[PDB]
């Protein structure tokens, strides 16, 4: 009496993930503006994905964040404070043409562990829906892990399939401007 798993068992993910939503209130503290749900199988990922609004359908000023269970989508978290992110800056036209598919590919890269061993350095990704231009970013745990960071950025850019000549940069969180712009630099580029 041994049922065949492939017939009734859900496809497990390497990690359990949590989806977060951010609603700008302008007044409230950034943190006060929430967890949606968590999942750790392929089937559960789609069930959640299929019933939530596409990023392009969200009001400007909102964010979707998918992070490994236990890691809050903020700079202050133990797994992000020494880290950084690969930033994808989209123009206004790309909201229609690339925002949604780019975000889905990002999700597939995360849950599918597409960066091989370097996937352990991945914390999560966030998509910012903004009137001036949408942004997508994959956050990693340590900005000093060049090998991991550069390989992730390379595979990520490849997966998105955007023109190879376009360069993207990685910025550490501890380096974000604290003045009025103070030139927010990149530590790496690919």
């Amino acid at each position: 009496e041994v049922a065949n798993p492939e017939h009734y068992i859900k496809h497990p993910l390497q990690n359990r993930w949590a989806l977060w939503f951010f609603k700008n209130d302008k007044s409230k503290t950034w943190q006060a503006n929430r967890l949606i749900s968590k999942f750790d199988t392929v089937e559960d990922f789609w069930a959640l994905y299929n019933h939530i609004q596409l990023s392009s359908n969200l009001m400007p000023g909102c964010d979707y964040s998918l992070f490994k269970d236990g890691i809050e989508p903020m700079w202050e978290d133990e797994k992000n404070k020494r880290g950084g992110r690969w930033l994808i800056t989209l123009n206004k036209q790309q909201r229609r043409s690339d925002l949604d598919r780019f975000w889905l590919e990002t999700l597939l890269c995360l849950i599918g562990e597409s960066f091989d061993d370097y996937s352990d350095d991945v914390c999560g990704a966030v998509v910012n829906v903004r009137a001036k231009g949408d942004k997508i970013a994959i956050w990693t745990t340590e900005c000093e892990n060049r090998e991991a960071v550069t390989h992730i950025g390379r595979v990520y850019k490849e997966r998105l399939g955007l023109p190879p000549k376009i360069v993207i940069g990685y910025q550490s969180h501890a380096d974000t401007a604290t003045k009025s712009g103070s030139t927010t630099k990149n530590r790496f580029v690919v």
Partner: peptide
């Protein structure tokens, strides 16, 4: 290094989007 990581290719994941 070392560890049986569960890896899924995009095609595998997309084929089960509706399943």
């Amino acid at each position: 290094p070392g560890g049986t990581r569960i890896i899924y290719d995009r095609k595998f994941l997309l084929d089960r989007r509706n399943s």
